[PDB]
Structure formats: structure tokens, C-alpha cells
Amino acid sequence: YGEKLKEVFLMLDNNVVECIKEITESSRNGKLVFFVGAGVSTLSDYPQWWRLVDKYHEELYGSPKKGNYSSDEYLRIPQIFYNVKGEMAFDGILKDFFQVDKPTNPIHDKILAMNPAHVITTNYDNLIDTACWKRGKYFSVISAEEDVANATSSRYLLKVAGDFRKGFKGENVVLKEDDYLNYDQNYPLISNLMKTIIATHTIVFIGYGLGDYNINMLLNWVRKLQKDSFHKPFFIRTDPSPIENETLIYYENKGLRIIDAASLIDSNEYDYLERYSAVMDLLIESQENKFITKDDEVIDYIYGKISPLFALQYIRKIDLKHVFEYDYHFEVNGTVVRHKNKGFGYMERFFELKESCDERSKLSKKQYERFNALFNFFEKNGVICMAKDAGTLNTSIEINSLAYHGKYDVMKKFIEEQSVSIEDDYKKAFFLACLGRWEESYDLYSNIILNSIDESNGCVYYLSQINRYRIYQSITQAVTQFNGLGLLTFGRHYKPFTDEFLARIEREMTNFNIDDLFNGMPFEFQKKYKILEFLSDNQFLYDDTVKLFELTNKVRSEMSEGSYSFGMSSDIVVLLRLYDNLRFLYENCLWSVSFHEFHQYIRNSMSLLIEKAEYERTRDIDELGFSFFGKKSGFFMEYYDFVNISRHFKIDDIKNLERS
Amino acid sequence: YGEKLKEVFLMLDNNVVECIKEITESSRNGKLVFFVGAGVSTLSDYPQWWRLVDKYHEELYGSPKKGNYSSDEYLRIPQIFYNVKGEMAFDGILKDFFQVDKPTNPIHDKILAMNPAHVITTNYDNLIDTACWKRGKYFSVISAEEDVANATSSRYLLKVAGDFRKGFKGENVVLKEDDYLNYDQNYPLISNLMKTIIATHTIVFIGYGLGDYNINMLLNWVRKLQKDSFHKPFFIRTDPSPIENETLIYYENKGLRIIDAASLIDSNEYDYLERYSAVMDLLIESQENKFITKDDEVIDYIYGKISPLFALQYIRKIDLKHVFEYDYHFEVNGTVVRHKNKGFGYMERFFELKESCDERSKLSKKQYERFNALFNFFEKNGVICMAKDAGTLNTSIEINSLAYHGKYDVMKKFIEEQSVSIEDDYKKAFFLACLGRWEESYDLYSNIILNSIDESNGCVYYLSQINRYRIYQSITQAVTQFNGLGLLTFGRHYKPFTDEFLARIEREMTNFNIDDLFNGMPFEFQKKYKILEFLSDNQFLYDDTVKLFELTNKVRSEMSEGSYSFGMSSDIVVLLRLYDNLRFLYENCLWSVSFHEFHQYIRNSMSLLIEKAEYERTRDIDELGFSFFGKKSGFFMEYYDFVNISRHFKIDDIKNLERS
Predict the structure, then answer these.
(1) Is A250 on the interface with B (CB under 8 A)?
(2) I want to staple B240 with a disulfide (CB 3.0 to 4.6 A). Which of A22, A25, B269, B327 is the partner?
(3) Number of neighbours of residue A391 by Cβ within 10 angstroms
(4) Distance from CA of A199 to the nearest CA of B (A)
């Protein structure tokens, strides 16, 4: 059944494809809003209003009108019924006719599966509410006036015509054209909410007739009154007869984009289920996994997903998973594994593009530089190849930050040099911090945040804000300890800074709860650099210490067990996570490396992993290990981890590590 | 200055204090918006409208109008000029006297300080923008109709009158009466957005008079259309004269609250800055611990903070720190130490009013049973006293989990008993999951998730969701290693599980993602139940184990150094911590106790305990040791520790104890 979807996709019109890609990118930002009504309710055998009209007709007459009633008498009959027979009979008929329990049809699940932000419906039923309830998502029900003020979430459910929730009483629901005429007089705030929500986002209609009624009001307001600054709404037509070409034109001028079903799938007249399913399917299958067929799509998509992160120096490989929305696992050694990609393999196909020599020629002129750039990105990052072809995979780390080397001589010469651009100023600020000259560096970050607001995507801005907060905390704890200890600190009543700096940072600072800064940056920022978000919380390391317990008993009590791990062993992977973490922190020049918590993390990691050479020392001389591990590869105390220990160990810690 | 504000607070009417409380609360939840206006610009010597109107007059005629101009010409003259003498001169004059750059004044700073989620202005100068730049709160500038749908943020800066961003030319702003008359017919979307922003938040006015055109228009709309479900906006009168009393009644009746400045401070007429500063700083004190020192409100505040937690049978003491926002350090032995309280000590007086039985009578009836409830709660939790009044404190662990007791014979009969409540169903679910019928447990979970949506305070919603996710994880790991080993597992290709249940579980949890569940929970829930958030991720098991490693090294150093420990030594600290973790986990009935990590944590902990006991057995007793801890009492191995070792150890793990 998916294959037929592929065929119809490759047999769509060029007017369709732009609408599909528009819809899917709208979803990707979480900025899609449906408008669902009686069309879907028809599927679930939910009772239809015309049947109610016949019940009213038979209640006030004896037989139905001979033939169709009229194009003008559907509206008035219920009014007559209420006006002469009164309210109570109306209530009773509503209660008898409407009180039924039904299940949910799959179209509802499909519609919700595209994680819509807000839903605005005319369905008198509670069925869509039930569909929301089952799928674990929670939404606010706003049915009458009092609910509008008392909002309970940032996601909304607007039941325009009212609901039977509060009771089976007519006033709560819109049935009579008196209510249709005094709609503005009665329900102003709901109207304002509808107007604003339509204006602010992309709205997709479905399950609606072309004429109907509400469509008339929305188009009459939307199109004529406003200027040329709106996003055109989308509509799904599912009638049996195809829409004529000129009808498309007329509704195009009026400001709606039609997606006609009759050109999509062929069937009989009555198969409403199939048409709805097909139309919603052309959306749902291609979130973006399956429609990718030509090798050009592969490179455009991957470049779209990676190009923003070019600004940073390096991306932590373990974090790269979030880079692809949990589609593939990237292992620290340098391989890839498919875990959730249910579509045509793009990450797989990229490696074939990498190894390829001449089939790269089957490509356009503009993409070749893109492929080369991606090549450099993954080469610098550390991606090598794919799992089954992964053989010899020796790895050497290179932390290119001159600060980590501790070559302080070059740093001062670097500072006393003319600036060229903002990023150089950022490196300048970190280098000064490495020199510990905190105050002018603080004024520097203030200047950078002041200057870099006007420029492009504010990676520099966000990083500056985070580092500024960090230096604030460092100054706080530093002055706290200094003025708490007094002259006893260094045998001198040393006051490091002046009251001016203190007062300035206090009055400027006493605000700005960091815990929403990532929520404060524009949407393309949170989409494009969601990767960095983990730096925001004061919790960022504490996911790896979890993995140290791997070697506390399962590589330590298992060390007493004497079993051998084949291939990828816990000690080496933890040590590799260690290199990766230091590289990501230093080469991106974040001040968090200075803090005590990071010091403790490296302390634990180094101490626990170095507790491997003990094992058993002069043990029961085995024979199995000689065949696989002969001529023992001594754990070399290379300059990297030696520097690590030097920078992040206390002297008493040295005492314990030698004593044990 | 603080005591000045305190005495002022003593002389405030209850009206003002209630307004203060509501405003502070609204600011906390980010549902506050300000209306900053022309007067605020007038502080910073921004050109007032009157100079422009008199200039416009004097271009025409020969001399400025003698005396007060008129009640109409103030609106008439600009149109006379614009229509009669030509449009170009209007833009020329506007450029001539609307280019002066002038600095910010502190009023704007304090306006931005209080976290103004949205900003709505009628000022037509880009000064507040520069203030936003310096404070770096990134905001969306919406000048004309060309940007309403192009909002690159979720925070709005609405220039209702428009600005000069696009340039210095007439139509970009609304000054003339011709523009005023066709106000609706030019910015539909802007007006609709202004209405919607007005509706669904809380509003505070400043920089406005008492009869200005815009405010009268808005209040007209609000009071004449909206029925009874709006939040009345607030106002700050800034006139150098005491308002008349009946005016307050009149304005209140039309639906607006006045917070007078004359009733607040007495200064000279030409001290506008002082008036604004005083009124604003009566808001900046937003630490709200001085707020009513009356005895009952201590109990009311404490209740408002702790009461939502009746559902949980127990809560960890270490997390209880997170309840009161860093104010106090709650220790495992029951002693509370003030950490961040910088005002009235409510907690300090709570233990005191427990101690004083006679003083308890000095309370109203409603806060008696309430106190009784607050007596039971901390009694069951076990918070004994202040550190200052800390006497002989013992800990009798009372894990009441029948599952922890491992008494399954009563468990099975409890399972097949008629269910009385959803809470009883939850306990049945936990006992079933511990029993072995995973499919039955998941079946009961599948029914309760559907049933529980009916009620409020849906904590059980979260518990069932998380437990369902973890039990699918367990099912997946099962069907992994079970069929991985095959017949040799139990001497048969015996599949306990079939394919039916697979379909539903795979669909629902393949759709689902844990890593956002609390984010979707309505805001009332996350305000009330911030505690049960670490259960979603892994970190709750591990933010304690950092202390584990911190203490294992210290104990290992003291081991060889021969030093002595005193007071609350690390052993009892970790031992208590272990008990608290276990009791929370089992009383709350979450399946997370079934994973490897909690086990291994318990192994290392009680391993450290037994090693400490083994050393304490043969430790050399010095004179001080004999004076303080004579008659050696080795760590008694009790039933609780025995269950701990018995339940989750491996033969090698216990084995290495004997050699150790």
C-alpha cells in the first residue's frame, strides 16, 4: 500500500508538490494548525443535522415535504419549532437525539499525529476531545466565555459552535440563525481568538464543503479587508466530482489553496474513508523519510540540517544524535548505526557518496562545493565510515586550543592586537579569562552583546550570554570567599576589585533567571541550534557519571569475575567520552571548565578508570588472555591525560591515587 | 530606604496591598503586560506634542495663539496644515524636530526589570527599543501591517501607533485626525492583536493621563462589549494632585482599578521622577517575605506551598529543598538550616508554634485542623527541629511497602480483590508488575490511563505514563534476550508472550517520547508538582551518588590515615540517604526499582557500610577513642539491610566481601 503511495507521489502535478513541501516545513517548526469539522464526524457515524431537521419536521408536521425541502427552509424550521413549541421540547429532542457513545476513526489519530499546535473546530461532538485524551497530549478546552480568560496551557482547543459539556441545553451551542446573527453580540472574545490564531499561523482546513456556511464568513473577512501581507490558508477537497480548473482560479483569487482529491486516487463515489485516508496519507508518510528518491535530495536535506552548526568549532559526537532527531546512533569510535530511520537511507547513502569516485559526477554544479564542505565538516569532526565496513579505527585526539596547552606567552601578544571581527573578540574574552583578568573581560562581553545583536544568527550572542552568567557566578563566589577569609587568605587584606565593579554588576544583574534564555531566542534559533541547549541548565555533565557506574561493579566486580569484553570495552569508551568532553568544552571556549563541578567529574572519571591496572596484580596466571592480548599493551601515561590530571586533581587526591 | 517602604506599607490601605499581591503573583507566572506611554518619554525630555502643535500653528498665520488654544484645534490644526500647504512640508518639519538622540532614564529600566512578558506602547519613538537592546531582552518589533504573521519570536513589542523604523515619513505613524477616523480600516490585524493581548493576560498602565483618547476608547470597548469574564486592568495615576474620591468609584464601576500616587508620597509638583520612582519601587521589592507578619499567614503561605503534595505518601527530604526555592537546607536527620531566607522566618516560627501549646490558641478556627494536617505531614516525613534546638535524634525506618517486605502470599490475595478506587488500581498495578504478569499489569495500566483523565490533580496520570514507558522498556529487553538465547534458556522454545499485545505497544510508544512529558503538563501542575520531574529523566538516581564518590575517597583516606570521625559521620549519612531513596521509591509505586542502576547503587553503598564496619571491628582505640566511643559497637546488620543485600546481590558480589 505504501508502494501505491510512491506511485501517486511520482504522479502528482507540479502544483501539488509546492503545497506538500510548504505543509511539511510548516509542521517542522511546530507551526501548523488544523481546522476540523463535520467532514470527519461523518465517518464516525455521528448523527447528521439534516436528520435532526427531519425529526423537527415530523414533530411539527405529519409527513416530509414532497421532495427536497428548499435552498431556503433548512434554517427556519428549527426556529419555528422553538418559537411555538418552546424551549423544553427543544432540550428534550436534543437530549434524545444526541446522547450516544461512539468510538474514534483513524483519521483523527492521523490528524493528531502531525503534532498540531492549536485546534479550532465546529464539531458539536466530544469525539476530537477524546482523540486528544487517548494520545497522551493534554489540551485546554475553551468552550464558553468564562474559559477564555482562564487559560491552562500554550495549546488551545477552540470549540467555535459550543459543546454539550456543561449540559444538554441550547444556550451553550449554536443552532438557530438568531444565534448566527447575534453571534458578534454574544461571543466577541472567541471571535477575536479565532481571528488572531488564523492571522498568526498557518491554518489547514479539512472535512469541509466548499460552500457550507463558515467558509463564507472566514473568506469574507480575511480576503477583502486586509492588505497583501497574509499567509494563504489551505483547503482539502474530497468531493466525488473533480474540481474544474476555473473553480481553482476563482478560489485562488479569493485566497485559498485547494488540494483536490480527485486527481490523487481513483475509486467509487461512496468511499469517503479511502479519500480522506489518501489525502491525509500524502501528508503523513512524508514527514521527511520516504519521498526522498533522487540523490540530490539527500545532499540538500543533509546540508539543510548541518549547515547552521558550521559556526561552532566542533560538535560533541555523542550529542550528534539530537542533530538528526533520533534517527541514527553515532558511536564514539566513528561508525554509524540505523536505529529509527524508516525511510530511504540518507545517512547510509552519504558514505557511498564519500567513498565514490565517478558516480559523484551524476550531480549538479552547485552541489559539488556543498559535498566538499560536508566532507571537511565530517573529516574534522571525526566521522569515518559505516559499521559493516569499519575495520582498523585507531584514533588520535587533537585539542587545538592554545589555552589548554597553557602556553601563556602567546596569549598576551594575542590580546595586544587589533581586532578584526566579533568572533575574534569572543576568543579574546576567553583568553583574558584564562589570564584571570575578569573585570575588563566583563566589560568586553557587555560590549559584544551590545554590538552583536544587529548581526546574523546570534550563536555568538547566546554563547556570550551564557559565559557572562558564568563569570558572574565566579566573581560572586570569589568575592564571597575573599571577603569572608580576609587577611588570613594570603597574609594580606587584599581587596581584589573596587566597589564600583561590585555595585555595577549588582544593579545590572538582579534579574535574568537564566532558566528561560533558550526559550527567549527566536524560533529558527531553537530549531537550528537546539543542539547547544544542554549548556543552559546547571545540570549538563550529570548524564555521564551515570556511565561511571558501569565500571564500579560491571567492570570491577566483573573484573573479579575475570570475563573478557569483546570489541568495545567500557574503560576505553569512558576514556574516549573524556577526550570528547574536554575537546568540546575547550575548543568552544566555554568557561564552565573552570568550575568545581567539572573538576569533580574529571576527578571521578580519571580515578575510576585508572582503577583498572590493579585488577588483581599478581593474579592466577590465566591462559585465555595470552591468545588475544599478548605482549601487554601498557596503559601509556600520554601527555593529554597527564595534563588532565595536573589541571584537575587536588594534592590529597594524589595521595589517595598513590596509596590505593 | 527599606524601613521607609515598610512604614509606608503599614500605612497602605488593604486595597493597595491586595493590588500589590495580585500584581506580584501575575508577574511570577509571566502573565503580566505593561502599557508605557508618552509621559514616560516626557521624563527623558522627549519632545511633547504641544511644541509640535504650536510650531504647526505658527507656520501658518503670524503669531502663536494667545491663551489656551481650543478644545478642538489641538486636533484640528495639523490636518489644516497637511491638507492645505502640502504633504512635503509635513515630512520636512517632522525630520526637523524628531531626530534628537536622548539617553534612557531609570523608569524604563525598572519597567523592564519585572519581566514584562509583553510590551504594548503608544510611544512613537525608538527609545524603549534601545533600552531592550541594553537589557538584551530580544523582542519582536511590529510597526506596520507587513509583519503580523512574520513574528520571529514568541514575545511581542507592539507599537500601536507605529514607529519611524521604515523612515521619517507621514503614513508610518498615526498623528492626524484623518488617520484617527479611518483607524479600523488600515490596521485590522494590529487592532485584533491588541485586543487579544488585552484579553488573556493582566495589564498595568503607566504614562497615561485620565482621559486621553486611546484609554477612553479601550475602556469603552471593554466595558460595553465584554460580559463578566475579563480581568480588570490596573492603573497608576501620575498627576501632581490628589484625585477626588467619587472619581475612584466612577472609574471602578466602569471596570478599572486606580492605585494613587498622591495617597502614596508627598513631593513637590515638579518631581515627576520621584513620583514614578516611588510608585515603581513599591513594586521592585519583589522578595515578598515581609508580606504580612501576622501569624496565620505563615501557615497560609506554608500551606499554599506544600499542600498539593497530599497525594504522595512520602517525599524525599533531599528533594524537599527544591520545594522552598533554595531558602533552607533540609538535612537527612531532620534538622533545618536557614540558607537563603532574607526576611521573616516562617519556617523558624513553624517549629516554634508547634512547641508552644498555649500560643496555639492565638489562631482562628480554620487554621487549626489545617495546622493539625501540617502536624501529621512533617511527622510522617520526620523533620524534627531546628539545628539550634537539636537534641538526641534517632531514625526508625518504616518502609511499609508490602512488596518491599516480599510477602507475596498476601499480595496475590490482594490482587484478586474487588477494586474500590483508581489509587487501589495503581497499587494493584505495582504489585502485579512485581508479581510477574507484565501483560496483566499493562492491561490494567491501559484501563487506568483512560479512566484517570476524568478527575483533577492528575499526578497518577504522570505516574501511570512513566511506569508504562518503563515497562515497555522492560518488555523490549525481555523479548530481546529471551529469544536471543532461545531453547537453552529454559529447555524449551517456550514463548510466554505473543504478537497481539505487540501491536498496541509498538504503535503507542513508537509514536511517544518521554523527553517532553512534563513540558506538556498544564502549568498549574508544574507549579504545584515540580518535585516529580527528575523521575522523567535518569538524574534523580545520581545527583546523590556524587556524594557517594565524594565520601568513598574520604573514607578510604581516613582508612589508612587512622583519623577519627565524630558527629554525623559519612557512614550514617549515606545509610540514611539509602533508606530515604528506597522508601520514596517503594511508597510511590514506580517500577524504576527494577533496573540495574538502582541495584548497583545499593551494592556500592552497603558495601562501603560493611567495609567501614569491618574496620571499626578492629580499630585501635586511643585515649580519646576510649573516652568517646568505648565498648565497641560494630555496625549491626539488621533486617532492612539484610533484605537489601539478599534481594539484588550476585554470588561474585557477595563473594568478594569474604575475601575483603
Answers:
(1) no
(2) B269
(3) 7
(4) 6
